[PDB]
């Protein structure tokens, strides 16, 4: 067992890449602020429906021009754990399983986390907020493994049938009351704020909704343009309500897509709204999701490097100064000149700059034509694509952390964290 974690942590060591002395440590101690905006594909990304653009706020931020770069090649990686899949990634730069949920099925294996490290290494308190009861998707358990310090469930809101639609909290109240909980914590934090409203099958009252549907014929599709306008108008308010609370200029803040909404269910009605056959290739350039991170100090911008949700610890715990050289982790930092472009997936499919692997076959991302003949680097890279996920569910499998006496990571114990009932 020792020696199985023994070969993990060998295996992680090659990838390793020294930050950006432009970026490294810049944000040291500031307050880094998450957002996770449910279902988000960026497709949606200066698209217009009836002459309306559905994200025009996400749309001015995805200029550049606003302070967040924007990474438009950047995917989730999840399976089928949905939203705990994108959680369980970005908090540790592991994968989920290949079946079932990492967060149901692994909630008390032992973790080396970002929200940890981050309270250990500068004094951090870390903290999620979500409109939905704590034990949906084993939360309650896996936070206290994860060490983070609070969770402000759906108790801490009025749940009432006005606040509420879908699954729990509407997502326009959800930010105007986490801005306000926010407002109110102690320097440094590191808050997740994880949305709802944007979330199948993407219904929304009519009284709620500021655009009109698509007229696809497919409700799922149609439903989500209504969805995806209201989460884009919630996000507005929230940035607004950051720069009103003086927690906008000296925060980190982060901005990324869960995983898809939009299943191959719906390539008829995709093919209507987006002019185009779904092709497995394209519905592989649809599993965009997107980054948006703003740093104090820097300025916003486009960065075309191809990544996925692994390689977001290792960017923060850069940002933040910290030495990552004994973490396991399998993502490599965004801003390092030396950042791994290459983005398995789940199913065993990949993505790299130049090409994409789906389903057994390679086409150049240009145009989405078979290619023909092998890439100079393509036995090597899928031959990583396949050891990365095996690798990852050996540490998940094996729970192999128990074994890591690390030098720079204080075993958390779980029975330390308690979520008390909120006031509402
Ligand atoms: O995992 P999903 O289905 O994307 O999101 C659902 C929830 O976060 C529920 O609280
Ligand atoms: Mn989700």
Request: net charge neutral; no cysteine.
């Given at each position: 067992?020792?020696?199985?974690?023994?070969?993990?942590?060998?295996?992680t060591?090659?990838?390793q890449?020294?930050?950006?002395?432009?970026y490294?440590?810049?944000?040291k101690?500031?307050?880094?602020?998450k957002?996770?905006?449910?279902?988000?594909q960026?497709f949606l990304?200066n698209?217009?429906?009836?002459?309306?653009?559905?994200?025009?706020?996400?749309?001015?931020?995805?200029?550049?021009?606003?302070?967040?770069?924007?990474?438009?090649?950047?995917?989730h990686?999840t399976?089928?754990?949905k939203a705990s899949?994108?959680?369980?990634?970005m908090?540790?730069?592991?994968?989920?399983?290949?079946?079932?949920?990492?967060?149901?099925?692994?909630?008390?294996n032992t973790?080396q986390?970002?929200?940890?490290?981050?309270?250990?290494?500068?004094?951090?308190?870390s903290d999620?907020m979500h409109?939905?009861?704590?034990t949906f998707?084993?939360?309650?358990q896996?936070y206290?493994?994860?060490g983070?310090?609070?969770?402000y469930?759906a108790?801490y809101?009025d749940?009432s049938?006005?606040?509420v639609?879908?699954?729990?909290?509407?997502?326009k109240?959800?930010?105007?009351?986490?801005?306000?909980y926010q407002?109110?914590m102690?320097?440094?934090?590191?808050?997740?704020?994880?949305?709802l409203?944007?979330?199948?099958?993407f219904?929304?009252?009519?009284?709620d909704?500021?655009?009109?549907?698509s007229?696809?014929?497919?409700a799922?599709?149609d439903?989500?343009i209504?969805t995806?306008?209201?989460?884009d108008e919630?996000l507005?308010?929230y940035?607004?309500?950051?720069k009103?609370?003086?927690l906008?200029?000296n925060?980190?803040?982060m901005?990324?897509?869960?995983?898809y909404?939009?299943?191959?269910?719906?390539?008829?009605?995709?093919?209507?709204?987006?002019?185009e056959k779904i092709?497995?290739?394209?519905?592989?350039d649809?599993?965009?999701?997107?980054?948006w991170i703003?740093?104090?100090?820097?300025?916003?911008?486009?960065?075309?490097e191809?990544?996925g949700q692994?390689?977001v610890?290792?960017?923060?715990?850069?940002?933040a100064?910290?030495?990552?050289?004994?973490?396991?982790?399998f993502?490599?930092?965004?801003?390092?000149?030396?950042?791994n472009?290459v983005?398995?997936?789940?199913?065993?499919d990949?993505?790299?700059?130049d090409y994409?692997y789906?389903?057994?076959?390679?086409?150049?991302?240009?145009n989405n034509?078979?290619?023909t003949?092998?890439?100079?680097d393509?036995?090597?890279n899928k031959?990583?694509?396949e050891?990365?996920?095996?690798?990852?569910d050996?540490v998940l499998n094996?729970?192999?952390?128990?074994?890591?006496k690390?030098p720079?990571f204080?075993?958390?114990?779980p029975?330390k964290?308690?979520?008390?009932?909120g006031?509402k």
């Amino acid at each position: 067992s020792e020696d199985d974690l023994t070969k993990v942590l060998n295996y992680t060591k090659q990838r390793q890449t020294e930050p950006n002395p432009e970026y490294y440590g810049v944000a040291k101690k500031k307050n880094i602020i998450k957002i996770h905006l449910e279902s988000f594909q960026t497709f949606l990304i200066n698209k217009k429906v009836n002459g309306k653009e559905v994200t025009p706020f996400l749309n001015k931020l995805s200029s550049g021009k606003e302070q967040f770069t924007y990474f438009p090649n950047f995917f989730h990686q999840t399976g089928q754990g949905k939203a705990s899949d994108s959680e369980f990634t970005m908090d540790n730069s592991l994968y989920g399983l290949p079946q079932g949920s990492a967060f149901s099925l692994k909630g008390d294996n032992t973790y080396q986390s970002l929200p940890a490290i981050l309270d250990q290494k500068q004094g951090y308190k870390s903290d999620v907020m979500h409109g939905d009861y704590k034990t949906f998707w084993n939360r309650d358990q896996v936070y206290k493994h994860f060490g983070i310090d609070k969770f402000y469930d759906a108790t801490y809101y009025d749940m009432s049938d006005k606040n509420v639609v879908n699954l729990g909290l509407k997502d326009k109240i959800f930010f105007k009351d986490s801005a306000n909980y926010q407002a109110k914590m102690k320097s440094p934090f590191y808050s997740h704020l994880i949305t709802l409203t944007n979330h199948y099958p993407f219904t929304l009252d009519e009284k709620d909704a500021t655009i009109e549907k698509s007229n696809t014929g497919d409700a799922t599709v149609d439903g989500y343009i209504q969805t995806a306008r209201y989460l884009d108008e919630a996000l507005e308010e929230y940035i607004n309500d950051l720069k009103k609370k003086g927690l906008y200029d000296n925060s980190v803040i982060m901005i990324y897509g869960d995983h898809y909404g939009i299943s191959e269910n719906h390539n008829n009605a995709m093919e209507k709204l987006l002019g185009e056959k779904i092709t497995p290739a394209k519905f592989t350039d649809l599993n965009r999701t997107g980054f948006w991170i703003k740093i104090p100090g820097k300025s916003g911008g486009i960065n075309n490097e191809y990544a996925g949700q692994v390689d977001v610890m290792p960017t923060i715990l850069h940002l933040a100064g910290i030495d990552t050289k004994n973490y396991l982790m399998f993502g490599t930092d965004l801003f390092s000149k030396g950042h791994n472009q290459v983005v398995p997936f789940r199913n065993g499919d990949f993505i790299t700059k130049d090409y994409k692997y789906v389903n057994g076959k390679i086409y150049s991302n240009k145009n989405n034509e078979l290619i023909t003949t092998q890439p100079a680097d393509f036995e090597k890279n899928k031959k990583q694509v396949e050891k990365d996920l095996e690798m990852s569910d050996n540490v998940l499998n094996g729970d192999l952390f128990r074994f890591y006496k690390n030098p720079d990571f204080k075993k958390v114990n779980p029975s330390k964290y308690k979520y008390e009932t909120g006031p509402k």
